[PDB]
């Protein structure tokens, strides 16, 4: 409307951290050295997609709290235009309010990336049956994402925080039934005018 | 307590059997002592433990001195600089201790001391890390030891005349000849995947890198005798031994003198990954 | 027992909960820090002093 | 009256005194079991016991802050 | 649902530990001194793999009870999807309820990894034929981990803590056969509601 | 399924000598020691044991014309097709017998002497080299456990058979010397896998 | 002669009076300048420096449908597979010899081939000729024709 | 900026020339000094004895090192061992270094002995003395040099 909340995440890695690479391109040419590459801009920082970790967040403990969201997460089904999720992230009429960035890494691929060997062991023979190859995040990174809700309709602040609480304790990204993506969030919002660049 | 003002407890009570009496006081008893924030005064017949009292004078040292099993601290409080130590002088002179209002702080240094001022204290320099859940306060001798570990860590990442061109006198003995002893050599395990594949790893930093390490592998140890390659598989007699680490000295020697190129062509064939 | 009741003492007789904790205090600047050999570290000259029920790490200034 | 005991059941692992505490229990350690051992009373522990505890006994006197 | 059982694993070294060293690029930049290094965090603490050990546990246990649990550990298997460990840890469809943490240490690499000296002794000489290095994690040293349960069935604490006695009696990570890795477990658990950060 | 559990106890009858693997353990303690005992870091004594039953079974076996590899030559792959590689391991498909390290049921002050060595030259009868070393007494008990994992019939034989060599010959080093003679006592029992599950 | 920094100088503590700060990098030399470049520059120079060395039978035609049906109904024929193979084809006949090989290549430390294992209960034999069925299947399927490559690899990878 | 360091050790990766370092950039007065690990030592005394307060080496070339070495080590004066822990207290500090070296060529007054390992091959007690007292002079002419210097030169003798 007339202001924009500008909120400010910094997440550091508590643990490895995986999100796969969805270039087909970038993949098929990084399956010769690693068997799951991490996904990577061309300007060789990593990206992670965050909207939909904040929106599963906010859906899974709206669903659980009792008020009534939509699930924009099964086989056709369609969001609602109603809910709160559906007001700050968006339904398929109306656009979303909340515009999440990619949360985009402060160091490039040559120093948070390493290959890293993972591997399957029998059972019985305790022995390796599969070994394969990995890409990884190191823990101590920093990444950097701008969410900016439009019409800041207040609680969407305190919505969002308790989304990355959520994401805080399960994680961001692939392989997060292992320990991998474990995060930590660091928020600094602000309040700024839509007119702010106008001289 | 925390003395913000106004001050608070841990439930956040900012000022749990709770009972109020006449200040003419906040009795907050808890499991972890029975506080009490006496207030302003200008009493529990019970266990006191701790006295929040508001410094602001013999009438203070009254009201203590009526306190049923006397108190183990008495933070002093709304009053100033010099208030607050005059009564704290005072409770000292009475044997009753004053207080005058995250990460640990786990100090890993010496226990020498001195008794300079009625402050018994002691010099240190020295450094402060912050791990996650902790500050340690640790002496120089650690700065010593990670300064030793940085730099046998640092001058073991340039071997010099690495990745660079220059040079020689290297043997020689046909492509056919290479292929047959690199395949004699993988049959038998001598040459095996991750041999080649750290030949091949110092051969692009140079030819020279891979004379060093086919040189560290063939180096028969005139302590022990023993040289780095990887043992035969089979019923070798000793001088066969012998013959067949010298035939692997020999053919890789002789494989740096060929191309890169090459040396990738016929070693992809004996392990796909470099 | 009951005379060091009455010299005003708590007294805890054989037939039957104040949580002490001496603290150390760190007491100097924190902001500028650097990182050598992946330790958050920070060179200081100063004092450690030893109060009662509190360790307290202090600076020059205090000297 | 009770250390050569815990040395027995190896349940202590220093057991520091003054340094006429350690020379006195010397003398009642043994006199104990001397009584012991003349009135019939099955020893409470041995010789052997009052001398491995004097084997893991520090001494030290008034004053002086040891730090374990 | 609305309940999600969180159990906060307290594990303490009872003998060395060993858990090898999977980053390539470390692994590499510490074959240099240490033969085998361990695996570490880029904050310098220790990573242990948690989840497998788990999974291999109640399936081993849960083959020999007599139930239909399958097995997950021989060469690219499938995982069923119709037992209590795909319920548990997973599926090919479905994804586990359990999201185990990795064991993270609570000390830094310096209090609590330590470079040992291992032989390879001749038998008709007594002698030394081969001397390597290892890196281990001292005994008495502790490690942490959270495993998050988020459909809670209730034989699921039961068999999360009947899997950590089997890795107290076989081990967790490493040489287990030559001692390593003999550990003991504390669970504190807890059923926290899945909206605890919306309120 | 089922597992073998065999609790190994042992008494040393001798003074007892195993080297400290850890090298920040044996630099500070050789400042005072020129030979530290292998301690843990909760103050006990930890003697390695997998590879004194592997090296007892093998020297055995080699005897009674059995087909056992050799694991202690200079870098010997183990065969895979041998008892020996079946209850201690081989390069594909570890041991079934997970062997615990012989901790102490005593601590480091109770069981561990410092003691004095010498080298007493031939023709002045006059010591030429001290050193000291510590060595753990007589008497000390260690308890490990053996954990076989799918049991066979002579496991538990042949695991005796090597407790028995041991005995004979030595845990440890110093061997030649007389350190290290030790007696071992054996319950096994035959547990159900699925024995912590209720 | 001339010295340029290029370690950022921002996280700098203070000792002695002095601002210091420990540092851990490489001193670079060139032809006019003496530079101080961090470990950051090493990796990007050590992996440049590593990429420019870088950068230098006969079966029926129905007998092939009901084989690649077995294959796909046990999952050790699957999309993935198939999209490889036809990937391989479209860059000729001997790559796509080369693929079947390499896949079928029966590793001789751990006796193990790159194909997907079967669904059910099979023994060791059996597995080994499916997997001598899928070498065979494929590699006769290479000296059939492009539009019949095409005509029985769909109805099992419909995609390609 | 100032540059107080050395500038030698400096080898050769791809066209760059290069030498690793590890040290302290101090601030003053935008000189900016790239100092070393030697000068934050002599600093760090001078805080230290500040807050405590208010309360000749024999020069030999460096082939005469290197061959001296040599055959100290192939004599088995010089092991592996003695030249890991000369390195230690090297990195301890010079008067460290000497300290050390004083320590191991002491002959005690009551055993008549030195803590260097004997010389291997037959020898006469005369040139035994004269080959320790050449391992006392050439360590001792080592800690004259720095330590990058001291490294290449015991790294091609225990690595
Ligand atoms: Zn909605
Ligand atoms: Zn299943
Ligand atoms: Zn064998």
Same mark, same amino acid.
């Given at each position: 409307?007339?202001?924009?909340?500008?909120?400010?995440?910094?997440?550091?890695?508590?643990?490895?951290?995986?999100?796969?690479?969805?270039?087909?391109?970038?993949?098929?040419?990084?399956?010769?050295?690693?068997?799951?590459?991490?996904?990577?801009?061309?300007?060789?920082?990593?990206?992670?997609?965050?909207?939909?970790?904040?929106?599963?967040?906010?859906?899974? =403990?709206?669903?659980?709290?009792?008020?009534?969201?939509?699930?924009?997460?099964?086989?056709?089904?369609?969001?609602?235009?109603?809910?709160?999720?559906?007001?700050?992230?968006?339904? =398929?009429?109306?656009?979303?309010?909340?515009?999440?960035?990619?949360?985009?890494?402060?160091?490039?691929?040559?120093?948070?990336?390493?290959?890293?060997?993972?591997?399957?062991?029998?059972?019985?023979?305790?022995?390796?049956?599969?070994?394969?190859?990995?890409?990884?995040?190191?823990?101590?990174?920093?990444?950097?994402?701008?969410?900016?809700?439009?019409?800041?309709?207040?609680?969407?602040?305190?919505?969002?925080?308790?989304?990355?609480?959520?994401?805080?304790?399960?994680?961001?990204?692939?392989?997060?039934?292992?320990?991998?993506?474990?995060?930590?969030?660091?928020?600094?919002?602000?309040?700024?005018?839509?007119?702010?660049?106008?001289? | 307590?925390?003395?913000?003002?106004?001050?608070?407890?841990?439930?956040?009570?900012?000022?749990?059997?709770?009972?109020?009496?006449?200040?003419?006081?906040?009795?907050?008893?808890?499991?972890?002592?029975?506080?009490?924030?006496?207030?302003?005064?200008?009493?529990?017949?019970?266990?006191?433990?701790?006295?929040?009292?508001?410094?602001?004078?013999?009438?203070?040292?009254?009201?203590?001195?009526?306190?049923?099993?006397?108190?183990?601290? +008495?933070?002093?409080?709304?009053?100033?600089?010099?208030?607050?130590?005059?009564?704290?002088?005072?409770?000292?002179?009475?044997?009753?201790?004053?207080?005058?209002?995250?990460? +640990?702080?786990?100090?890993?240094?010496?226990?020498?001391?001195?008794?300079?001022?009625?402050?018994?204290?002691?010099?240190?320099?020295?450094?402060? +890390?912050?791990?996650?859940?902790?500050?340690?306060?640790?002496?120089?001798? #650690?700065?010593?030891?990670?300064?030793?570990?940085?730099?046998?860590?640092?001058?073991?990442?340039?071997?010099?005349?690495?990745?660079?061109?220059?040079?020689?006198?290297?043997?020689?003995?046909?492509?056919?000849?290479?292929?047959?002893?690199?395949?004699?050599?993988?049959?038998?395990?001598?040459?095996?995947?991750?041999?080649?594949?750290?030949? #091949?790893?110092?051969?692009?930093?140079?030819?020279?890198?891979?004379?060093?390490?086919?040189?560290?592998?063939?180096?028969?140890?005139?302590?022990?005798?023993?040289?780095? #390659?990887?043992?035969?598989?089979?019923?070798?007699?000793?001088?066969?031994?012998?013959?067949?680490?010298?035939?692997?000295?020999?053919?890789?020697?002789?494989?740096?003198?060929?191309?890169?190129?090459? +040396?990738?062509?016929?070693?992809?064939?004996?392990?796909?990954?470099? | 027992?009951?005379?060091?009741?009455?010299?005003?003492?708590?007294?805890?007789?054989?037939?039957?909960?104040?949580?002490?904790?001496?603290?150390?205090?760190?007491?100097?600047?924190?902001?500028?820090?650097?990182?050598?050999?992946?330790?958050?570290?920070?060179?200081?000259?100063?004092?450690?002093?030893?109060?009662?029920?509190?360790?307290?790490?202090?600076?020059?200034?205090?000297? | 009256?009770?250390?050569?005991?815990?040395?027995?059941?190896?349940?202590?692992?220093?057991?520091?005194?003054?340094?006429?505490?350690?020379?006195?229990?010397?003398?009642?350690?043994?006199?104990?079991?001397?009584?012991?051992?003349?009135?019939?009373?099955?020893?409470?522990?041995?010789?052997?016991?009052?001398?491995?505890?004097?084997?893991?006994?520090?001494?030290?006197?008034?004053?002086?802050?040891?730090?374990?």
């Amino acid at each position: 409307a007339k202001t924009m909340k500008k909120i400010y995440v910094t997440m550091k890695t508590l643990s490895p951290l995986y999100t796969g690479e969805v270039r087909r391109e970038d993949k098929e040419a990084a399956q010769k050295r690693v068997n799951f590459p991490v996904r990577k801009t061309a300007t060789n920082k990593v990206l992670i997609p965050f909207k939909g970790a904040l929106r599963s967040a906010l859906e899974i =403990m709206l669903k659980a709290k009792g008020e009534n969201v939509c699930d924009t997460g099964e086989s056709r089904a369609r969001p609602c235009g109603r809910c709160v999720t559906c007001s700050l992230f968006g339904s =398929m009429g109306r656009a979303g309010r909340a515009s999440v960035d990619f949360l985009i890494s402060n160091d490039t691929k040559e120093q948070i990336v390493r290959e890293s060997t993972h591997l399957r062991i029998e059972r019985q023979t305790k022995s390796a049956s599969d070994t394969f190859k990995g890409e990884e995040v190191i823990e101590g990174a920093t990444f950097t994402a701008t969410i900016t809700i439009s019409n800041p309709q207040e609680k969407d602040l305190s919505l969002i925080q308790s989304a990355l609480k959520f994401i805080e304790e399960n994680g961001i990204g692939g392989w997060l039934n292992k320990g991998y993506g474990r995060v930590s969030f660091e928020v600094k919002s602000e309040d700024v005018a839509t007119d702010r660049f106008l001289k | 307590i925390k003395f913000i003002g106004a001050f608070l407890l841990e439930a956040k009570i900012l000022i749990t059997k709770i009972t109020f009496y006449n200040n003419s006081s906040v009795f907050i008893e808890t499991h972890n002592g029975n506080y009490l924030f006496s207030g302003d005064i200008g009493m529990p017949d019970g266990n006191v433990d701790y006295l929040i009292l508001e410094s602001t004078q013999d009438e203070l040292i009254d009201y203590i001195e009526r306190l049923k099993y006397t108190p183990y601290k +008495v933070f002093l409080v709304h009053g100033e600089k010099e208030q607050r130590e005059i009564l704290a002088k005072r409770i000292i002179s009475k044997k009753i201790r004053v207080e005058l209002p995250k990460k +640990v702080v786990l100090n890993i240094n010496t226990d020498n001391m001195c008794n300079f001022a009625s402050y018994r204290l002691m010099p240190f320099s020295g450094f402060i +890390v912050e791990k996650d859940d902790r500050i340690e306060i640790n002496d120089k001798n #650690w700065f010593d030891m990670i300064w030793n570990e940085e730099y046998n860590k640092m001058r073991s990442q340039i071997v010099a005349e690495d990745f660079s061109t220059d040079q020689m006198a290297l043997p020689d003995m046909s492509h056919d000849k290479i292929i047959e002893n690199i395949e004699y050599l993988f049959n038998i395990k001598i040459l095996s995947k991750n041999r080649i594949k750290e030949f #091949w790893e110092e051969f692009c930093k140079g030819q020279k890198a891979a004379i060093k390490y086919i040189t560290q592998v063939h180096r028969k140890n005139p302590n022990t005798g023993r040289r780095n #390659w990887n043992p035969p598989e089979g019923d070798f007699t000793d001088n066969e031994i012998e013959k067949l680490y010298e035939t692997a000295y020999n053919t890789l020697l002789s494989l740096i003198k060929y191309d890169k190129n090459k +040396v990738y062509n016929i070693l992809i064939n004996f392990n796909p990954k470099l | 027992a009951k005379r060091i009741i009455s010299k005003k003492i708590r007294v805890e007789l054989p037939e039957n909960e104040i949580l002490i904790e001496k603290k150390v205090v760190l007491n100097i600047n924190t902001d500028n820090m650097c990182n050598f050999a992946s330790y958050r570290l920070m060179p200081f000259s100063g004092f450690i002093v030893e109060k009662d029920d509190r360790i307290e790490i202090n600076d020059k200034n205090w000297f | 009256g009770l250390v050569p005991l815990l040395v027995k059941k190896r349940k202590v692992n220093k057991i520091i005194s003054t340094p006429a505490t350690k020379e006195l229990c010397r003398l009642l350690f043994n006199d104990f079991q001397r009584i012991q051992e003349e009135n019939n009373d099955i020893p409470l522990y041995s010789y052997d016991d009052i001398e491995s505890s004097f084997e893991i006994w520090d001494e030290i006197d008034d004053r002086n802050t040891i730090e374990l």
